[PDB]
Amino acid sequence: MDLNNAYDHCKNIIEKHSKTFSKAFAMLPKHQKRAVWAIYAFCRRADDIVDEGENPKEELEAFAVEFDLFMEGRLETEDPCWIALQDAFERFPLDPAPFYEMIVGQRMDLYPKTIDTKDDLLHYCYHVASTVGLMLLPVLAPGKVSRVKTGAIELGYAMQITNILRDIGEDLDNHRIYIPKQMMIEYGYTRTDLHNKKVNEAFIQLWEDLAQDAEHYYRNALATLPEYPVYSRTPVGGAAKMYRAIIQTVRNNDYQVFGNYVSDQMKKQIIAEMQ
Amino acid sequence: MDLNNAYDHCKNIIEKHSKTFSKAFAMLPKHQKRAVWAIYAFCRRADDIVDEGENPKEELEAFAVEFDLFMEGRLETEDPCWIALQDAFERFPLDPAPFYEMIVGQRMDLYPKTIDTKDDLLHYCYHVASTVGLMLLPVLAPGKVSRVKTGAIELGYAMQITNILRDIGEDLDNHRIYIPKQMMIEYGYTRTDLHNKKVNEAFIQLWEDLAQDAEHYYRNALATLPEYPVYSRTPVGGAAKMYRAIIQTVRNNDYQVFGNYVSDQMKKQIIAEMQ
Numbered sequence: 001m002d003l004n005n006a007y008d009h010c011k012n013i014i015e016k017h018s019k020t021f022s023k024a025f026a027m028l029p030k031h032q033k034r035a036v037w038a039i040y041a042f043c044r045r046a047d048d049i050v051d052e053g054e055n056p057k058e059e060l061e062a063f064a065v066e067f068d069l070f071m072e073g074r075l076e077t078e079d080p081c082w083i084a085l086q087d088a089f090e091r092f093p094l095d096p097a098p099f100y101e102m103i104v105g106q107r108m109d110l111y112p113k114t115i116d117t118k119d120d121l122l123h124y125c126y127h128v129a130s131t132v133g134l135m136l137l138p139v140l141a142p143g144k145v146s147r148v149k150t151g152a153i154e155l156g157y158a159m160q161i162t163n164i165l166r167d168i169g170e171d172l173d174n175h176r177i178y179i180p181k182q183m184m185i186e187y188g189y190t191r192t193d194l195h196n197k198k199v200n201e202a203f204i205q206l207w208e209d210l211a212q213d214a215e216h217y218y219r220n221a222l223a224t225l226p227e228y229p230v231y232s233r234t235p236v237g238g239a240a241k242m243y244r245a246i247i248q249t250v251r252n253n254d255y256q257v258f259g260n261y262v263s264d265q266m267k268k269q270i271i272a273e274m275q
Numbered sequence: 276m277d278l279n280n281a282y283d284h285c286k287n288i289i290e291k292h293s294k295t296f297s298k299a300f301a302m303l304p305k306h307q308k309r310a311v312w313a314i315y316a317f318c319r320r321a322d323d324i325v326d327e328g329e330n331p332k333e334e335l336e337a338f339a340v341e342f343d344l345f346m347e348g349r350l351e352t353e354d355p356c357w358i359a360l361q362d363a364f365e366r367f368p369l370d371p372a373p374f375y376e377m378i379v380g381q382r383m384d385l386y387p388k389t390i391d392t393k394d395d396l397l398h399y400c401y402h403v404a405s406t407v408g409l410m411l412l413p414v415l416a417p418g419k420v421s422r423v424k425t426g427a428i429e430l431g432y433a434m435q436i437t438n439i440l441r442d443i444g445e446d447l448d449n450h451r452i453y454i455p456k457q458m459m460i461e462y463g464y465t466r467t468d469l470h471n472k473k474v475n476e477a478f479i480q481l482w483e484d485l486a487q488d489a490e491h492y493y494r495n496a497l498a499t500l501p502e503y504p505v506y507s508r509t510p511v512g513g514a515a516k517m518y519r520a521i522i523q524t525v526r527n528n529d530y531q532v533f534g535n536y537v538s539d540q541m542k543k544q545i546i547a548e549m550q
Contacts, residue, residue, distance in 0.1 A: 056467045110465050112452050114389035175450060175470055177387050190385050192331045195450055 024239035130156030151224030158217035169258035299514035373409035405431030426499030433492035444533035
């Protein structure tokens with residue numbers, strides 16, 4: 001299939017898996033938008049290999065080998081996702097370095113994990129989320145990457161913490177815990193309260209402590225938005241605030257995270273205010 | 276209630292929770308046997324606080340405070356377990372040091388845990404299992420503790436590894452993983468194979484590697500048995516071999532540990548050969 005249909009394939013991936021990101025990046029100009037679809041398909045595939053799929057270790061090493069071949073310019077395929085990414089790499093000065101770091105981050109999720117400190121939390125968030133911001137920067141802010149880089153890394157922190165805070169029970173059911181141990185210790189929230197899906201006084205203290213770190217990172221990221229080109233300000237800002245709004249969504253639902261979505265209407269309001 | 280009935284209470288605890296240990300230590304002479312019941316009740320209570328019970332952190336600190344008061348000789352109670360332990364401590368030169376280390380070990384299970392290396396495995400096994408051997412030594416081998424101490428520590432390693440290898444699926448259901456990460460990495464056994472309760476080629480390799488460490492510790496522990504007094508040789512040896520026999524029980528059942536008991540008859544045979 002041709003380039004248009006390769007990109008359309010990636011558009012169907014992003015629309016299926018994230019209403020927030022697809023709404024946000026749909027407001028980019030044509031070629032930047034198509035490149036963002038292709039880069040998203042790359043992140044989506046690697047994460048799906050690890051989080052779903054039968055032999056995650058062998059499937060992810062074959063994905064890494066395939067990217068190695070791709071970067072050498074010697075991958076011949078009919079895979080629409082690679083056809084789309086090939087054009088994105090040729091069309092914009094994308095950097096392979098954060099693409100490799102993403103794979104390293106995905107390797108972290110192949111074996112059980114314990115986050116000890118906030119430091120280990122940020123190290124994980126960097127590799128699975130900040131890297132995505134870094135892959136997009138040459139598309140979103142051409143010639144200004146060093147200037148807005150720190151903000152995009154922190155926006156990674158902010159959205160990955162937000163994701164973790166929303167998905168406490170989902171991750172527990174899949175035998176994953178991303179809450180730092182030392183904060184469970186600080187606040188007196190034990191493994192047993194967690195296994196019992198308890199929303200108590202100590203849980204809220206711990207939850208709000210993490211949420212406030214996320215909010216700080218969101219504010220830092222949003223303060224760099226004037227340095228983006230005008231056509232990227234509403235997409236990037238809108239994405240950030242739509243994702244930040246999950247935190248208050250959980251607050252309003254009394255922190256019930258053992259069974260949360262920003263509504264479609266809320267998303268529309270956020271985009272209109274950006275606009 | 277009086278001393279006899281305090282000890283009988285502890286006898287009912289050990290008989291209810293461990294057929295192996297109660298059969299083994301029932302062959303000790305009277306007062307050593309009663310002391311072993313009292314010491315077992317102490318370990319049983321602390322472990323039950325952590326593994327069951329509503330507020331494990333507050334319940335375990337109150338258990339620790341109570342032992343602090345006990346050791347000062349200033350705990351006044353009608354609790355049969357303390358009445359029994361009080362006599363054991365007065366009757367034999369028991370050392371409080373490994374009793375405190377047990378509590379430290381139980382503290383390790385209050386918050387999520389990741390074993391990285393075999394080293395971290397042994398550090399955990401020491402505090403939750405080797406300490407129990409060390410509490411019993413003045414009762415089992417009076418005046419010979421320094422001589423048989425290393426063997427009892429390793430018997431701790433051996434039985435706790437045995438326990439871990441038998442309880443893989445039980446611990447997974449309770450969101451606990453004691454398999455060292457680095458061996459999952461060495462053998463290519465992922466979190467996803469575990470969550471899927473897969474008994475594959477890599478699982479068996481990892482399982483047998485741990486089992487062979489346990490077997491080495493059992494052989495080391497059993498080599499010290501001539502240094503015990505005659506009345507402790509069949510209890511200690513019998514306990515050790517009854518617990519070791521779990522490993523071959525799992526082998527014979529094709530390593531199916533996601534749903535294993537040494538039979539009552541097998542236990543009888545092991546004791547007869549000791550005898």
